[PDB]
Amino acid sequence: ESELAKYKEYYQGLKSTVNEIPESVASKSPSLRTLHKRLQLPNELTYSTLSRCLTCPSAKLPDKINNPTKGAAFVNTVPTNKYLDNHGLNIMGKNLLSYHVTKSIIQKYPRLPTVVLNAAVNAYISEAVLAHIAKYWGIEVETTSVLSRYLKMEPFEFTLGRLKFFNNSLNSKDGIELITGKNFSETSALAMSVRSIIAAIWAVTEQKDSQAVYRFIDDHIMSRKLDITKMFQFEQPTRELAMLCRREGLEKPVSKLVAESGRLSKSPVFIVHVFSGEETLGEGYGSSLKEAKARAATDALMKWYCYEPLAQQEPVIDPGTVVV
């Protein structure tokens, strides 16, 4: 009685259960149920759908399997079904996250420049942040071999609750770390898992409640801290401020000395104000007149760009970035 036949049966069964992802088997996965309750997923999101989110489009193995001596071994995953992977869910999650985050940031800061808006959107939904969110949620990657799972006779309900994709065993062993595409990166897989979860939440909830994918996104993404002031870097804010005042109906900005102490010293203090007529548009401090002037101009620009409107206000649409 050969053990190779038993291993063949185990491998075929694992492949079949990953191809079909039946609910009868997926609902016994402690990882999936614990994750479901932890994230408060809707009660009508099936454990099979959650496992579908976890699984990735790993259909055909690469040719670099043939060369483990060259620094790459893939002996952890089984081929998936082209119609039961998470590609479309990943795309849908990308779309939803991009739209919602961009809309939220804009409505919070109507006047953000495009570059800063893009930077903030990345700060919120980048690949690294999504991977961190996945690992924080508990999404854990399958690293053991199918043969090892056979040897210790592991049920497939445990594998169905683990992130699955072509991951390189031997990745950083001995400090080699052969480079690969994003199809063999754990970070990208984790981000795909998060986006697929978002997409599944929407897919199941849109009909009854158009919202609640957006509420999930506000709960788990837009709740994250981000100081928008730390995303700016100006060059010639004096010129930019003059152009902004000219574009608007404001009187030309003139910088003036409001206070001074410690002149003729290592570290003096000068307080300057950029007046537009009688109205102070920016307040700057510095150890030099030039420093104070620059700081006042930058302060005025930031007040302008980062102005946040009340939620009860009529929507504000900016005239575009100040172009000089």
Partner: protein
């Protein structure tokens, strides 16, 4: 065998990666440089600890025999031969007044 640390302590592939990294980087390792292996299309990014960096660079280890002296006597000259070039240190030992200098 008479060979350097990089040649004695590394597997062949790791040796090729390290040598290529040093060649691209000017003669010494750097943290993050995707290296291209010759006559092959695969690229790598070696990762090492500072102990590995220090031990893999070329160096030669010399030991003396049983010398009749004291540590306090040897230090007087070994503190002069601190980081000098070997040729300069040899000249200093040639023209020193101390018995330890010959050895």
């Amino acid at each position: 065998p008479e060979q350097l640390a990089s040649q004695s302590l590394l597997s062949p592939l790791k040796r090729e990666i390290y040598e290529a990294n040093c060649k691209i980087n000017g003669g010494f390792y750097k943290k993050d440089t995707i290296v291209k292996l010759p006559n092959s299309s695969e690229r790598y990014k070696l990762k090492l600890t500072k102990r590995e960096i220090e031990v893999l660079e070329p160096s030669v280890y010399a030991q003396s025999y049983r010398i009749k002296s004291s540590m306090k006597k040897a230090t007087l000259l070994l503190r002069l031969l601190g980081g000098l070039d070997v040729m300069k240190a040899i000249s200093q030992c040639h023209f020193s007044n101390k018995k330890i200098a010959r050895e």
